[PDB]
Design a protein around this ligand. Structure first.
Ligand SMILES: Nc1nc2c(ncn2[C@@H]2O[C@@H]3COP(=O)(O)O[C@H]4[C@@H](O)[C@H](n5cnc6c(N)ncnc65)O[C@@H]4COP(=O)(O)O[C@H]3[C@H]2O)c(=O)[nH]1
Ligand SMILES: Nc1nc2c(ncn2[C@@H]2O[C@@H]3COP(=O)(O)O[C@H]4[C@@H](O)[C@H](n5cnc6c(N)ncnc65)O[C@@H]4COP(=O)(O)O[C@H]3[C@H]2O)c(=O)[nH]1
Ligand SMILES: Nc1nc2c(ncn2[C@@H]2O[C@@H]3COP(=O)(O)O[C@H]4[C@@H](O)[C@H](n5cnc6c(N)ncnc65)O[C@@H]4COP(=O)(O)O[C@H]3[C@H]2O)c(=O)[nH]1
Lengths: 92, 92, 92, 92, 92, 92
């Protein structure tokens, strides 16, 4: 009960701050959907290019799944940074 | 004219790929609006806490504007990574 | 009251998870002290090298305050990542 | 012998600078221990939640091992940035 | 045809800007070669240290392939940032 | 004298490893030159667009100097990661 009071640096948040944080998280939800769509596109592209050594080598050299993972991580950590700017913890 | 053909590694893009890229960029637009809103909130919070040395010191110690900048950069570079996964350049 | 229940993706945490999170944050406190010490060292180094154009140019070219800021940000975001691994939010 | 004189940009370091660098590295050691502890916790959590499809899916969706790896990398690169601020190499 | 006009925020580029971008990309090519060389060195080091449990454990603990991957990603995203500074898109 | 033996985790390096590290650093030197060139281009672009409120606002909105700084930091930390993969320190 009231676990946030037990975590160092966590202060009480107004409803306004909570709403802004939840807004960040909902925009992140939309980004989650978009990333899933891109991953599906990559599956389909690779599949359709099966037994096309040149196209398969092109895709493998571009490393699109690795770049999608990088982008996902950047989106999530940017979300976390914005939420930190809103919530403003009391600790380093 | 057709400048993309003059840049190393840039290949021709299908309309599908262009649409996915533009989708990433529009979601980024919404994030731009959200970040502007958070910055306005920070302006108002600081202003309202003028001549409240304790609250001013708290805000300054939390560094919310620096964290908002960090989050903005992360969102933008994640956008760039996702767009790279879609467009798949031909170069390192 | 119980603000964590109002934030999307935040689940109830056991006392064990809270303790691990607080541990991350206390180690971060020690890092805060170390970074303050390094910043003091940089102040003193610059001051002692006043009116020594060569040493001043060397320091300015090395950009140690910018690198200290980079390191601080990395430590803080790594702390945030570890705390996320512990708390395991329910959202993207 | 004296390999640091053979590496571009590496200058001679005072004992004070070496001590500060070693301090950064020892704090990093403590972080290494903490990360090992968190990884053990994750092993135990997953194991205890074996044959609990809902809890297993929750953990898998949270990706805590990936976030622990992200945090480890951030801690290490922040350490490297702080050590660079101390040692101040002579090269880009 | 003229796909860049269909992507949000992409403006027309002068030949000067295109040349600077291509310069960034060619320097990146040289970095690609250097990273391949380092990876070959790591293969050879590991191979030569086969059936030397101590050296194998040392290498595994240092995680040099993971650090090479980190460095590759940093080089590529720095390239992307510089190219963005040159091309200056019109969108967030 | 032999300061590297006094820093935790630093092992003795072969001449091969030193040469690879110095190679990374020389490529970084070339990147330093390229970044200086881009910064000069940005100075000239801004200057030439003086008293052209529209072009000045465009440049300011694109934030090219901030993106150049981001790219510089990424190049430098990628260099550091590659050099770490080569030198392979003995510490976290
Ligand atoms: N005004 C303008 N800006 C441009 C243009 N092309 C790129 N940019 C900018 O520079 C970045 C490109 O960096 P990059 O070449 O290292 O990575 C690019 C490149 O790898 C890929 N890409 C872009 N256009 C492509 C294309 N036409 N074909 C193939 N891949 C392409 O998408 C990546 C991310 O694009 P982005 O829109 O997020 O960032 C742009 C964008 O901010 C351009 O034509 N005009
Ligand atoms: N003052 C204050 N600041 C808070 C509070 N909750 C979060 N913050 C701050 O914003 C960050 C949360 O960002 P996030 O929601 O994107 O990631 C959070 C979230 O994914 C997770 N987490 C935090 N509280 C949780 C909880 N109660 N349940 C589940 N997961 C939780 O831990 C991550 C990192 O926490 P952190 O302490 O390093 O950074 C906080 C912290 O700096 C809060 O209640 N009060
Ligand atoms: N002037 C000066 N600067 C130094 C010296 N040693 C390191 N630095 C600087 O601090 C960084 C070292 O941080 P680190 O100890 O966390 O990571 C180091 C360390 O993990 C590894 N390394 C460096 N010298 C080593 C060595 N002698 N043996 C083994 N590993 C070594 O290389 C990493 C990256 O080196 P770098 O040259 O890119 O950055 C240096 C460099 O900018 C040094 O002797 N003199």
């Amino acid at each position: 009960d009231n676990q946030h009071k037990k975590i160092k640096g966590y202060r009480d948040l107004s409803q306004e701050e909570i709403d802004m944080m939840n807004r960040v998280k909902e925009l992140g939800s939309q980004f989650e959907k978009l990333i899933q769509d891109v991953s599906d596109h990559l599956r389909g592209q690779y599949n359709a290019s099966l037994h096309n050594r040149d196209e398969i080598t092109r895709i493998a050299n571009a490393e699109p799944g690795r770049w999608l993972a990088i982008g996902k991580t950047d989106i999530q950590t940017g979300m976390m940074a914005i939420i930190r700017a809103i919530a403003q913890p009391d600790s380093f």
